[PDB]
């Protein structure tokens, strides 16, 4: 029968964190990039990838002006950054908390191939995850992030890929909630290929249906979770063109058909679209006339950080210029998630 | 990939019907009872069960005062009643339509045992259902009703019962939508046994999760469907007592965790609770402070009809007394589904 | 937990029938064709389709020489034929039983479209099936037949088609076994399209895996069932050519990977291959060096009947010529299912 | 469609290993116990648990007399033992290979709780498993072992426990076969509680059905796998008593209803029954008159090792006495897996 996964007090705690992250006007800075991931972005400057450079850049983002406090509800950190300190010696989790944000951590170990499929993958990192989550919890992290990747192709995503990725997501979410950490469920559908908007909407609805069925099977408390999907958009190679209102209608329609109202918030990923494009799409999604029972906001790594990373150019003289790039982009997305953003 | 089940115009038609049924203040009169089902209720008088008596009683309900027009959004008919005419010679579908209602039909053939379970059943009636639905559609019916029954017990509802009933519901819903008829999905959980409110909430959430996963698998258009669940209530034999706000919170919580926002409306069944109790619970559900993206209204056979059936007592002299019983109850539930009902 | 679907005596009865049908050297004559199905075959003569002609032709097949007694373990009848009598006035079930055969009946009502798929279908006929099976049981039928059809295509068979057809098969099999009738599970994969042998083997293994998972879920007693699959063969339009040993290896390999040893027998369908080709393939399957825990035999409508139907030509003078065509083909397949058939 | 998980040469390699392990008369010594697991067994002596004592004891088992060569087809090692050397300096993998055995390794990281269940667990250890398997493969291991644990209780094993454990098993098996290692699938059903033989048979059939459906979904090559189930036996606390022929009939019946013939072999676990009891049950299983398309043999940790561990008593003087205990037990089980063992 019912052997409750969570006590009422555990649920109180999870839902308080979740509402705190997505509170009106707020979104998530995704600062989580590994040393292999951030290497590409430091090469686009010519700054070499060092503990000191990575640390200084994330200090740039986290220590920025007091105007980003109402904008940023949470910050996702990579493992090593969680234990780094700013110049003044404050730990980065404390820096984030002092600005009113919630600290978050990337707990997945990356993707591995699924044999017998066409380039399909699943995500690993469940081993020892409970101990890791307990440690992260006492080191200041209140939420976690796990990335599953699905690609649209002729035979993909297959039944196996959808089933396996949904199962692993539900398993991760269960462990996180047992440790008092709000899981962010991120079933990313890559925007690669020439598929059109209808096919992305179809696949997104199938993936989300499987995800919430798996979360039901694993007894996940949905009020203590967040969703991080792709926007429904055509593939990069698609010739047909779509307005922002059509992308917004496709996105909100896909979410209304799958995501139950109990889910606290939907934090979209930018997924390889430009900064302005991301803010405009998020704005259109929040103006869509359909009823939207959850918060619709941003979780943006690159769409927040790109102009700041260019303005910085690796040289320490540019600190305030870079920080004002980032602040402008954070204010833009803060207005977009309220539907108030006009360029 | 995606081979669309429905054209955009078919979807337009289905969603227009569905919004028409559950429009604010409106609910469904369930007038559908077989000749074996209505026999019990005509014996509680002592009126014998005849085509003439059944026909006269349903004329009593359908021809009632003009005050029930804003109250009743739809009327579910049994097969033979659909082809019966009132005294003036108008067919009952025309009578219903003239009052502004939508006509509906019970398409299921009843329950059969699932071997290898403990008293669990599934519903039959899919054979030839498409032709039946086409005929009903041109005979005036715009929506259909299918009843699946699940019971709470020590090992029940089992995985097989939930899977099979969800599958048959999705199959029925697909056929109906192919024929232009809005399916009402009714996964009824019987209020039998001593189980408490928490266990009913748990089982209701599992059943609804399976139902919407099956509807996703069968490509059902959710904007063109309605849901008819039980309220979440303790079993009849449960000693523990619950307020109406606790039943309402359990019900709305169970729906927010499962039912996606695209579903047009939720029409509750009374399920063996009294007329006043049904109106009070429906009122409390509609006052619950949780956000409720769908219409929450009534589909009541017995909770609308019981006082009218007693007032009539089988004798034709009582027609207007019976009709005023029914009108009072319809006005009560119309206020309840807006949260405006105070006894 | 376990609430047994069948008593030990019911299981005894089912397994006795099942072993009786597939006993060494024996196979099934599929005489089941509707009046719309047999019309094509009576037009290929120019005999018009009448109760008298159909009845006379099936008398031709059922009354043939005493040499077909060790060859034919069972005969599948259409509904009306079950109630027809031979010239001497014996009912056809009695004629079949006197020759040592088991009587069988087609209980499915045909295929209906699955909306949202590409030309995929499911089979109907579960409504009232239990009463029909009880009646057939007391009218002499000891086994039943249900045909599910799956087609290979670019996106087919889809997950929905496989799931739905497996579910309906399991449901039918459950009802039949509750009534004391051995179900024959027939998941036919059509040999249409240009797909090669590997793809047919892949799809056949997926379909059979889903079928036996569904039969496990529905508590089917496998010792009381038979399997009627396609042989694994390339599509009709496939240019690549395959020997009989390669078709046999693909078939037996597909069955060893899916079908549990408890299944009593596998009765192959000819599926649009000629009489000689069917006997040669069945022979090669029974000579394959892989271990084969079940009986491997034939269930052939057209591969038994085609030369007899031509020899008869609709004119009553040819009775014994037609019957000797049929007898020769029955002896050929009887040797093939023992691996003893050399042309 | 079909994107083959394995080339034909990879399949050749896997099936050669699998047939080599279970070849007639041969079984598996399970020497895999962690330092926390072997501690209990070294305390039952009073030998303290040290690298030297563990190493010496496993040398005792692996270096035993030449009579155990036809008895032992494989040896499962714990991680550290794989890198240990015998007295003469030969690595243990080489010692095992020289005696004609196949080397195997335990790749699972243990069980973790499933939240929302009643004491149910799943197994972890998939993270980085592919690299570990590649390393083990070049360090001499040809097969792997993964232990999933299910317990019988009033509501257990639940749907979630069966689904999750089957999924993880299929995932492990896929990774192993990609690396050229034969996975042994071990869904252990604990013999705890008062449940009788029928209930264990029911649960075992459900678990194995789910396991092989998952292995089909993940494209596992069954000819390159082995199965390691429990024998079907009553719970430890069950008062009803059963003969060995009834346990054997229940076991073989459960396997015939689930395990497809392609599976190369079934290596039973002793699971807390004595040495003699294990040999007698294995003997009865191999004499059961039902047809058995797979090899039925032993994989025994404790039922091979208990008398040797007592005879050794931790003191080096007893080496040959202990080794002759182990040799006698290995000869007994070698006769049992051929049905030739009479005490």
Residue numbers in the entry:
A (entry chain A), B (entry chain B), C (entry chain D), D (entry chain C): 2 to 344
Original paper wording:
Here, we expand upon our prior work and demonstrate that one such 200 kV microscope, the Talos Arctica, equipped with a K2 DED is capable of determining structures of macromolecules to as high as ∼1.7 Å resolution. Our work demonstrates that a modern 200 kV counterpart to the Titan Krios (i.e. a constant-power two-condenser lens TEM with an autoloader) equipped with a DED can produce SPA cryo-EM reconstructions of ideal biological specimens to resolutions better than 2 Å.
We expand upon our prior work using ∼150 kDa rabbit muscle aldolase by further optimizing our imaging strategies and processing methodologies, including computationally estimating and correcting for higher-order optical aberrations, resulting in an improved ∼2.13 Å reconstruction of this small complex. We previously determined the ∼2.6 Å resolution structure of rabbit muscle aldolase using a base-model (i.e. excluding imaging accessories such as a phase plate or energy filter) Thermo Fisher Scientific Talos Arctica equipped with a Gatan K2 Summit DED, demonstrating that high-resolution reconstructions are also attainable using a two-condenser lens TEM operating at 200 kV. Intriguingly, these data also demonstrated that the DQE below half Nyquist frequency is higher in counting mode than in super-resolution mode. Given these results, we attempted to further improve the resolution of aldolase by conducting additional studies in counting mode at a higher magnification (73,000x nominal magnification, corresponding to 0.56 Å/physical pixel) to utilize the higher DQE within our resolution regime. Iterative 3D classification and refinement steps were performed with D2 symmetry imposed throughout, followed by Bayesian particle polishing and refinement of defocus UV and global astigmatism using RELION 3.0, yielding a ∼2.3 Å reconstruction. Our aldolase data exhibited both anti-symmetrical and symmetrical aberrations, as evidenced by the resulting per-Fourier-pixel average phase-error plots. The aldolase data also contained weak magnification anisotropy. Local resolution estimation of the resulting reconstruction revealed the majority of the core of molecule was resolved to ∼1.90 Å.
